[PDB]
Amino acid sequence: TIKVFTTVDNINLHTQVVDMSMTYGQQFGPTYLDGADVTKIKPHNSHEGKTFYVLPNDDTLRVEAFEYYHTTDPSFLGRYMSALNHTKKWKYPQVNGLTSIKWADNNCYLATALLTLQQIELKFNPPALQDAYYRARAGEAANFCALILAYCNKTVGELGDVRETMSYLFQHANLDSCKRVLNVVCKTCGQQQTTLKGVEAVMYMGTLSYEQFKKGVQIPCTCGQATKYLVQQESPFVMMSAPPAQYELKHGTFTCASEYTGNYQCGHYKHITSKETLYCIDGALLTKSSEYKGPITDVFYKENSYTTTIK
Ligand SMILES: Cc1ccc(N2C[C@H]3CC[C@@H](C2)N3C)cc1C(=O)N[C@H](C)c1cc(-c2cnn(C)c2)nc2ccccc12
Ligand SMILES: [Cl-]
Ligand SMILES: [Cl-]
Ligand SMILES: [Cl-]
Ligand SMILES: [Cl-]
Ligand SMILES: [Zn+2]
Ligand SMILES: [Zn+2]
Ligand SMILES: [Zn+2]
Ligand SMILES: [Zn+2]
Ligand SMILES: [Zn+2]
Numbered sequence: 001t002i003k004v005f006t007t008v009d010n011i012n013l014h015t016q017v018v019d020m021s022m023t024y025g026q027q028f029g030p031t032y033l034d035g036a037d038v039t040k041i042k043p044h045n046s047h048e049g050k051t052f053y054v055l056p057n058d059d060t061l062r063v064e065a066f067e068y069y070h071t072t073d074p075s076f077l078g079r080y081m082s083a084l085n086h087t088k089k090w091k092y093p094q095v096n097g098l099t100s101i102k103w104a105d106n107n108c109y110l111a112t113a114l115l116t117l118q119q120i121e122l123k124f125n126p127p128a129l130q131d132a133y134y135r136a137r138a139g140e141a142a143n144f145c146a147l148i149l150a151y152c153n154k155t156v157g158e159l160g161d162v163r164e165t166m167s168y169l170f171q172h173a174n175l176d177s178c179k180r181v182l183n184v185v186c187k188t189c190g191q192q193q194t195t196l197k198g199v200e201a202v203m204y205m206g207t208l209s210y211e212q213f214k215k216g217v218q219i220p221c222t223c224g225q226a227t228k229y230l231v232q233q234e235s236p237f238v239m240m241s242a243p244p245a246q247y248e249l250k251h252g253t254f255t256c257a258s259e260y261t262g263n264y265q266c267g268h269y270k271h272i273t274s275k276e277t278l279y280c281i282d283g284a285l286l287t288k289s290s291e292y293k294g295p296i297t298d299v300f301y302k303e304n305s306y307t308t309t310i311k
């Protein structure tokens with residue numbers, strides 16, 4: 001026999017004694033070690049004392065699991081552990097003061113999201129995401145990336161869209177204080193004003209330019225081509241997206257941006273960030289230039305409180 005700790009959150013640990021002739025699956029249920037599925041594996045001697053993740057099998061663990069992850073999905077733990085099994089093997093080099101990811105397993109979109117998250121103000125609601133976020137900012141991002149995959153219901157190797165990943169992540173973050181007031185001007189119908197809250201207040205699809213959004217954009221009306229423009233914005237940042245197209249990025253006019261090259265779904269992302277000059281982060285690779293023209297699909301801008309001056 002050996003003694004071990006079981007857990008669902010790696011915080012509340014539960015002391016357990018195992019029989020060395022019985023696989024973990026028969027004694028605990030699905031059991032994992034550092035992401036590795038050890039369900040159908042018998043206890044070893046090097047396994048003495050180590051802490052194992054277990055799928056919740058009593059009410060105490062179910063409550064602990066929800067409090068840490070904010071999900072009751074019985075598949076979440078296994079998807080998380082399956083991702084972690086790869087992400088713990090990726091490299092996370094510091095590039096220009098930011099934790100990036102060396103290229104592997106189609107992770108370019110994850111590197112771009114990871115880099116963006118280090119440059120905008122965000123509070124995640126699940127303790128598991130917040131804790132991993134902090135550790136990620138300090139260079140240890142394997143767990144954060146695994147969690148991103150599990151929360152986005154994506155698997156290692158799958159082809160990911162950065163805008164969609166950020167949107168999923170935003171939905172697990174505290175964006176309640178975020179507010180966007182819009183005004184639509186139709187010649188026949190008139191003037192209608194809507195207010196958005198949460199994730200919808202910080203994201204727009206249609207143009208990369210925050211200025212253009214403030215000046216107004218052409219959207220078809222219910223009557224059938226009105227104009228929508230930003231009336232008031234209340235958020236620490238905004239994300240502007242558009243299908244990839246050549247675009248000029250000017251130093252000091254944006255926080256950071258997603259560059260996307262190639263075919264729909266199987267292309268490659270790079271990350272552009274505005275520091276004292278423009279830096280391009282391609283996984284572990286870093287280039288700099290005073291101007292930038294290229295195929296851009298997301299642009300992030302800082303914000304606090306904006307009210308329009310249109311009467
Ligand atoms: C890399 C990648 C992975 C997965 C997906 N999926 C998209 C759809 C289908 C499955 C799942 C994930 N989503 C539900 C997309 C891309 C991808 O390539 N995203 C780039 C940024 C992109 C976006 C758009 C676009 C977005 N919205 N509209 C109206 C348009 N248009 C593009 C046109 C050409 C090239 C790139 C484009
Ligand atoms: Cl929740
Ligand atoms: Cl791997
Ligand atoms: Cl890649
Ligand atoms: Cl949540
Ligand atoms: Zn407990
Ligand atoms: Zn929650
Ligand atoms: Zn892998
Ligand atoms: Zn969710
Ligand atoms: Zn109308």
Ligand SMILES: [Zn+2]
Binds near residue numbers: 186
């Ligand atoms: Zn109308």
Ligand SMILES: [Zn+2]
Binds near residue numbers: 251252
């Ligand atoms: Zn400049």
Ligand SMILES: [Zn+2]
Binds near residue numbers: 107
């Ligand atoms: Zn890639």
